Design a protein around this ligand. Structure first.
Ligand SMILES: [Cl-]
Ligand SMILES: [Cl-]
Ligand SMILES: [Cl-]
Ligand SMILES: [K+]
Ligand SMILES: [Mg+2]
Ligand SMILES: [Mg+2]
Ligand SMILES: [Mg+2]
Ligand SMILES: [Mg+2]
Ligand SMILES: [Mg+2]
Ligand SMILES: [Mg+2]
Ligand SMILES: [Mg+2]
Ligand SMILES: [Mg+2]
Ligand SMILES: [Mg+2]
Ligand SMILES: [Mg+2]
Ligand SMILES: [Mg+2]
Ligand SMILES: [Mg+2]
Ligand SMILES: [Mg+2]
Ligand SMILES: [Mg+2]
Ligand SMILES: [Mg+2]
Ligand SMILES: [Mg+2]
Ligand SMILES: [Mg+2]
Ligand SMILES: [Mg+2]
Ligand SMILES: [Mg+2]
Ligand SMILES: [Mg+2]
Ligand SMILES: [Mg+2]
Ligand SMILES: [Mg+2]
Ligand SMILES: [Mg+2]
Ligand SMILES: [Mg+2]
Ligand SMILES: [Mg+2]
Ligand SMILES: [Mg+2]
Ligand SMILES: [Mg+2]
Ligand SMILES: [Mg+2]
Ligand SMILES: [Mg+2]
Ligand SMILES: [Mg+2]
Ligand SMILES: [Mg+2]
Ligand SMILES: [Mg+2]
Ligand SMILES: [Mg+2]
Ligand SMILES: [Mg+2]
Ligand code: NA
Ligand code: NA
Ligand code: NA
Ligand code: NA
Ligand code: NA
Ligand code: NA
Ligand code: NA
Ligand code: NA
Ligand code: NA
Ligand code: NA
Ligand code: NA
Ligand code: NA
Ligand code: NA
Ligand code: NA
Ligand code: NA
Ligand code: NA
Ligand code: NA
Ligand SMILES: [Sr+2]
Ligand SMILES: [Sr+2]
Ligand SMILES: [Sr+2]
Ligand SMILES: [Sr+2]
Ligand SMILES: [Sr+2]
Ligand SMILES: [Sr+2]
Ligand SMILES: [Sr+2]
Ligand SMILES: [Sr+2]
Ligand SMILES: [Sr+2]
Ligand SMILES: [Sr+2]
Ligand SMILES: [Sr+2]
Ligand SMILES: [Sr+2]
Ligand SMILES: [Sr+2]
Ligand SMILES: [Sr+2]
Ligand SMILES: [Sr+2]
Ligand SMILES: [Sr+2]
Ligand SMILES: [Sr+2]
Ligand SMILES: [Sr+2]
Ligand SMILES: [Sr+2]
Ligand SMILES: [Sr+2]
Ligand SMILES: [Sr+2]
Ligand SMILES: [Sr+2]
Ligand SMILES: [Sr+2]
Ligand SMILES: [Sr+2]
Ligand SMILES: [Sr+2]
Ligand SMILES: [Sr+2]
Ligand SMILES: [Sr+2]
Ligand SMILES: [Sr+2]
Ligand SMILES: [Sr+2]
Ligand SMILES: [Sr+2]
Ligand SMILES: [Sr+2]
Ligand SMILES: [Sr+2]
Ligand SMILES: [Sr+2]
Ligand SMILES: [Sr+2]
Ligand SMILES: [Sr+2]
Ligand SMILES: [Sr+2]
Ligand SMILES: [Sr+2]
Ligand SMILES: [Sr+2]
Ligand SMILES: [Sr+2]
Ligand SMILES: [Sr+2]
Ligand SMILES: [Sr+2]
Ligand SMILES: [Sr+2]
Ligand SMILES: [Sr+2]
Lengths: 73, 237, 56
RNA sequence: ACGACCGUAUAGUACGAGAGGAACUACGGUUGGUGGCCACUGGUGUACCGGUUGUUCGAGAGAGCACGUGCCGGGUAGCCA
RNA sequence: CGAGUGGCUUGCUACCACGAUGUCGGUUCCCUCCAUCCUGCCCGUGCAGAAGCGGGCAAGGGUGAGGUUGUUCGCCUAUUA
RNA sequence: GUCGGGUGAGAACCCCGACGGCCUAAUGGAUAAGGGUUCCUCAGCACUGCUGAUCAGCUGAGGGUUAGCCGGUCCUAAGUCUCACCGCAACUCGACUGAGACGAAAUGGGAAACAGGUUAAUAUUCCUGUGCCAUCAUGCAGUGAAAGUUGACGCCCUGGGGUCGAUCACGCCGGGCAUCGCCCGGUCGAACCGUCCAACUCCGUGGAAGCCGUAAUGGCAGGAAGCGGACGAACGGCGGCAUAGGGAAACGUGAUUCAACCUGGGGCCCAUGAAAAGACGAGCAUGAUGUCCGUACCGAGAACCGACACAGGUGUCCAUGGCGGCGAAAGCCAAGGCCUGUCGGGAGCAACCAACGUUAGGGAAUUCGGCAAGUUAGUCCCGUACCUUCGGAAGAAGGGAUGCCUGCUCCGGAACGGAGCAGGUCGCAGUGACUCGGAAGCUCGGACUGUCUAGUAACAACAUAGGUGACCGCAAAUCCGCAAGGACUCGUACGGUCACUGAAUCCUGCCCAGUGCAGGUAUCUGAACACCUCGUACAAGAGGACGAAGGACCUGUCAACGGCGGGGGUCUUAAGGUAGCGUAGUACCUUGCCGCAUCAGUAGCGGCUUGCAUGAAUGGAUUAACCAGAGCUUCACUGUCCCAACGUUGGGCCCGGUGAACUGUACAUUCCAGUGCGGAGUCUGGAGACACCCAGGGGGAAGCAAAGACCCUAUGGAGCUUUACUGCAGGCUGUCGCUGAGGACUCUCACUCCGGGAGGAGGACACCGAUAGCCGGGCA
RNA sequence: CGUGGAAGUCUGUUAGAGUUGGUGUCCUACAAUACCCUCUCGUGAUCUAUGUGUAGGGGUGAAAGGCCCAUCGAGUCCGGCA
């Protein structure tokens, strides 16, 4: 997915942008409906195209390891 | 010589100032007399230009509309509470005394009623540990154990936008844009690449500091550069 | 680009204008201050001892 | 304002065991220089003649412009090597 | 060992110029010197010849093209009288 | 530009016609700034105009700018000022907080005007016609009234609606041409009023379990398609406006592609893309009122800035005129503009110079170096190496095709869109001009796009992502201020400050002795105040005791400054150079040795390498991609060269007119020698020499230009450094004041901070004032 | 295979910005930094108009001691000053 960077930037930089952006663009399960329809709206902003649930979450992932802890306690 | 870059800063000229007129809102804890009876519905989620993180728009019962330091997992429609009796859920804000031990907290107050000071940046969080009638021990994001007044308010949960710093900027342009939203002069010219007239490390036939980098704490501004009161340097040892 | 002739070309900004108070074309219309009599800066008239030789 | 060299005959001779190998002289040419000339060869030749692209003058005919010939082909006199 | 000439090298001096006498190399173009590389005429030879070696008179003409190097100098190649 | 003609005392350049040309994002049209009357008319030529002048941006006199609806005015933006408060010795000074005001003329927001006519000069301003907005008054309706909507918003891709224009078809009106029958122009008509509505959204029906839909994404039993319906757009269509206007006339009709304008879908952000006034919400009639300021002209190779009528500089809109072609490209041509990038006449027009064309054979031999020039080129088809971070390298390289004419096929709704086929056919040449890469390899540097010495440096330098270390829990660290106060900060460690290194990949050894920083510290040292002894009727002063930071001392630390040798088989001073790399952009010796390549190679490349004096974030090595970066090799090409020639244009030369400057102690026709402060036209001796003028290329006048930049000197200057001398800020620390009650401790009442408040935290500390010790090129 | 249309992406005298070589022309200039050809960037750390802020031991500086009105290793004016 980091093919836009051409032959520039080097392995590490574009390997990370690809991984991060790949997981960012993945189908995400909405906390409301449960449908895989959550898409990134901005930095840390997520929204379900199905039920319109707009919520906060990681900058590139809807859920972060730290966020998944808040529940358990 | 001439005043170094760090000295031009303090003057507060446009170049060094933050784009305050472009910032949305000062995210401070709402005030309540007592009793808690205060709740609001999240009407929207916005982007905060001053912190590169999501901030939630809330509308309280008394018809009060204000932006809030949004934790992770706060959606539109969600009902938030603020007060002593505020339900122990993510997004709610109650004094540390009412917050259970071992629970991740964000936007922690330094002194009760200040509106929150600690743990506000993307994805971080404080950690409430010890309880008492006098002091609530919080473990701040830097790892420091901070003893606080149990009456200091603080939101439950971790701050939204976590993991932001995990992706590299890749190019100067990306930094450029982020920098334009902060009170920071960028790019950065190494002192070693300047003239002696401009910086303590300036001058010489080849670039290298003409003295050791570790400077005394008592050094005057204009000379306090490099490694300030470094307890040590390097990785080894 | 040269600092001389090629840079004189952009000079179409108006600053110093006829002053309401003193009548000199020294009223900086962007600063709203007269460089000659100090109108806009002080109630008293701009005047300095160095405007003449010390013993005069 | 002429300097110098190669070649041929002299001669496979004189000389020398042999190997090898001259000269005088008479010739032919080359090179460098020099002065001049253009029949010849070559260059130029925005004189000239033709071909042809784009566009404008309605088409045709016949023309302008495309840098001081649009481009391509041929090229007289002269000037030249 | 001893006697000299030159004024291309270098060193020495500090006379000249610091109200400026523009650098090295190269180039281009002109004149000159002889301590002659070739060419002319000669003497000697450890001069048969051929080819050389040493020397003398002699400055008319000639002394060219290239590879590295800014190079001068020099190294190298093929031609050359 | 030329030929006629006009006016005039006078005409190359003032005017008319014709012919001939130039400008096409400009040399055309509208403007902002800035200019300020430069605008128009009349009369002039003393001035100004690169020549002339009857002309004029010149001289003089007159005249000229008309607004409810075009700007200003109103609003708010970054931000500014004023007042108050506070500081300051003080102010015309100074930060904060309040209040108020200012802050947008092309180009932020914003009530409302269109079309025509008229002048020598204005014009949505005047006049004609038609229209619109606001306030107010009266009348009627109306009691709704303010929630909400609007003003009001980033970047990239894209659909749909759709006007101007352009083009196609055909008809009408007029013009042109004259083998043809083709070619050009026109065929009009606003604001405004009324009306229509696509998209979006929603509603009812319907009942899809696989269908609906898109350029694409997508949608759905949480209810798909289909059917009906609410809401709802254009600067658009339609009707009026209009027996208005406009035209000599006709006074069209359809289509395609569609700027403007309208309305949607999608994608991106460690970036989040103004505010306020105002409008809407919220009717109609009639009438009144709508003041004030701007308005001429230029807007540039003559109206602006640059001393100039300066080849420079200077914002916006016309980006859709035709052919062409991918094109807002070239070239050519309209509309419109101009012959004022404003001196002419003459010589086949010499030398010489500028800019340029063509050169036979050779082909980089030129040169520091292919500098300069040339070569190549568009488009389609075939084909394409090493290496590589798998993206790329790559248009690698290399090869073929290319026009016109005839008749066709395919894609598409179609284009005046595209892709092909068969036949015929011309040239030396079919991207025929124009437009339009030369190609390949090796090495060095920096990863990359980016930055820089305005005016000799564009680079390897700066930056960058990335890597790393340092400081700080915010009453912070860092920084500004004399103070009052302030930046960072609408920020909070995933932060931001201070530094270093400089993408990726493989790595980054040893040294804490010195210097730096930091922690500790029994003991040693360590100021002042208070306290103690001596002294003094008091005082100066001498000494003691206690002892802060600081130092001594101990420890930590090198991705801190830096270091990593000599001798021998440990010495200094801590260690003694590990991976690597290596004759290096670092190697003196040096053209090192071997090899490659060449006829020949101080060059280049590889190998060796004891390295004068390489080496690991003073980062080492290495490297795809990128580069107006340094070096080298090859193919191709060629006037760079052998070696020069001829030609073209502008000068150069002669003539009319205009008309400077540099320079000048005097004398001066010199030459060869000598002499001289040792580098003489001028002295000495000779030689030569009739005067004057034209052209030339520059040998000399140690030519002209600049009180030499180099070197030295001056008890000259400045910028910069530091363990130079001396001081000054600043930081740290003790002490006194503020400061209070009961060598360690409690408290609350000053004082500080948090808190809207109540009250909470802290607390005689901290802040502040004063003094003392330490650090202190930050500064003088 | 198609769809899509990413990029401090490419070619490009689109506009615009820049300034490599000619060590060309000019060098009492057209010009106290100009002319021509060649060359670089041209969707972005882009370019640009107007408004606005920062002031002299002070600004500003992707750092050249660069720039702060032809003035910069400390602007300019007047004064100190004969
Ligand atoms: Cl950052
Ligand atoms: Cl106006
Ligand atoms: Cl769509
Ligand atoms: K001298
Ligand atoms: Mg806040
Ligand atoms: Mg900024
Ligand atoms: Mg840097
Ligand atoms: Mg430097
Ligand atoms: Mg310094
Ligand atoms: Mg370095
Ligand atoms: Mg360094
Ligand atoms: Mg001289
Ligand atoms: Mg002799
Ligand atoms: Mg001779
Ligand atoms: Mg007249
Ligand atoms: Mg007019
Ligand atoms: Mg002129
Ligand atoms: Mg030839
Ligand atoms: Mg040569
Ligand atoms: Mg070239
Ligand atoms: Mg079809
Ligand atoms: Mg090298
Ligand atoms: Mg670079
Ligand atoms: Mg420069
Ligand atoms: Mg460059
Ligand atoms: Mg980082
Ligand atoms: Mg970093
Ligand atoms: Mg960095
Ligand atoms: Mg660097
Ligand atoms: Mg080697
Ligand atoms: Mg190391
Ligand atoms: Mg001098
Ligand atoms: Mg010197
Ligand atoms: Mg000095
Ligand atoms: Mg406070
Ligand atoms: Mg000093
Ligand atoms: Mg500006
Ligand atoms: Mg320097
Ligand atoms: Na001698
Ligand atoms: Na020389
Ligand atoms: Na001779
Ligand atoms: Na040589
Ligand atoms: Na004229
Ligand atoms: Na309509
Ligand atoms: Na066209
Ligand atoms: Na680029
Ligand atoms: Na050490
Ligand atoms: Na080292
Ligand atoms: Na570049
Ligand atoms: Na030529
Ligand atoms: Na001369
Ligand atoms: Na100096
Ligand atoms: Na694909
Ligand atoms: Na240039
Ligand atoms: Na100064
Ligand atoms: Sr706050
Ligand atoms: Sr607050
Ligand atoms: Sr230095
Ligand atoms: Sr280590
Ligand atoms: Sr220019
Ligand atoms: Sr300007
Ligand atoms: Sr004032
Ligand atoms: Sr005074
Ligand atoms: Sr013979
Ligand atoms: Sr024989
Ligand atoms: Sr022609
Ligand atoms: Sr061609
Ligand atoms: Sr002799
Ligand atoms: Sr001889
Ligand atoms: Sr020499
Ligand atoms: Sr040598
Ligand atoms: Sr105009
Ligand atoms: Sr006259
Ligand atoms: Sr006029
Ligand atoms: Sr105003
Ligand atoms: Sr406006
Ligand atoms: Sr369309
Ligand atoms: Sr006008
Ligand atoms: Sr111009
Ligand atoms: Sr015309
Ligand atoms: Sr004239
Ligand atoms: Sr010819
Ligand atoms: Sr060569
Ligand atoms: Sr050569
Ligand atoms: Sr080809
Ligand atoms: Sr590197
Ligand atoms: Sr510049
Ligand atoms: Sr690296
Ligand atoms: Sr140490
Ligand atoms: Sr080793
Ligand atoms: Sr001359
Ligand atoms: Sr680009
Ligand atoms: Sr140069
Ligand atoms: Sr010229
Ligand atoms: Sr010049
Ligand atoms: Sr040229
Ligand atoms: Sr480009
Ligand atoms: Sr003075």
């Amino acid at each position: 997915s980091s093919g836009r960077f051409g032959a520039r930037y080097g392995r590490v930089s574009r390997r990370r942008v690809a991984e991060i952006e790949s997981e960012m663009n993945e189908d995400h399960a909405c906390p409301n409906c449960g449908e895989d329809r959550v898409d990134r709206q901005g930095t840390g902003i997520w929204q379900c195209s199905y039920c319109d649930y707009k919520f906060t979450g990681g900058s590139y992932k809807p859920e972060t390891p730290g966020g998944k802890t808040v529940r358990r306690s | 010589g001439r005043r170094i870059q760090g000295q031009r800063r303090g003057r507060g000229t446009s170049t060094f100032r933050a784009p305050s007129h472009r910032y949305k809102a000062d995210l401070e804890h709402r005030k309540v007399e007592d009793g808690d009876v205060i709740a609001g519905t999240v009407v929207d989620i916005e982007h905060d230009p001053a912190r590169s993180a999501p901030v939630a728009a809330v509308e309280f019962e008394d018809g009060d509309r204000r932006l809030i330091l949004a934790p992770e997992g706060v959606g539109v429609g969600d009902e938030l509470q603020v007060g002593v009796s505020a339900e122990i859920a993510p997004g709610n804000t109650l004094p540390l005394a009412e917050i259970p031990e071992g629970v991740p907290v964000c936007n922690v107050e330094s002194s009760p009623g200040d509106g929150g000071k600690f743990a506000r940046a993307s994805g971080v969080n404080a950690q409430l540990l010890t309880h008492d009638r006098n002091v609530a021990v919080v473990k701040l994001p830097s790892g420091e154990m901070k003893r606080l007044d149990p009456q200091c308010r603080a939101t439950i949960g971790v701050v939204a936008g976590g993991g932001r710093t995990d992706k590299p900027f890749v190019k100067a342009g990306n930094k450029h844009h982020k920098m334009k939203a902060r009170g920071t002069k960028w790019p950065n010219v190494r002192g070693v690449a300047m003239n002696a007239v401009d910086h303590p490390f300036g001058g010489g036939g080849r670039q290298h500091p003409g003295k050791p980098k570790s400077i005394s704490r008592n050094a005057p501004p204009g000379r306090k550069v490099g490694d300030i009161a470094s307890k040590r340097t390097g990785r080894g040892g | 680009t040269g600092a001389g002739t090629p840079s004189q070309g952009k000079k179409n900004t108006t600053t110093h204008t006829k002053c309401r108070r003193c009548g000199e074309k020294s009223y900086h219309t962007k600063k709203k201050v007269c460089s000659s009599c100090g109108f806009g800066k002080s109630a008293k008239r701009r005047d300095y001892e160095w405007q003449s030789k010390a013993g005069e």
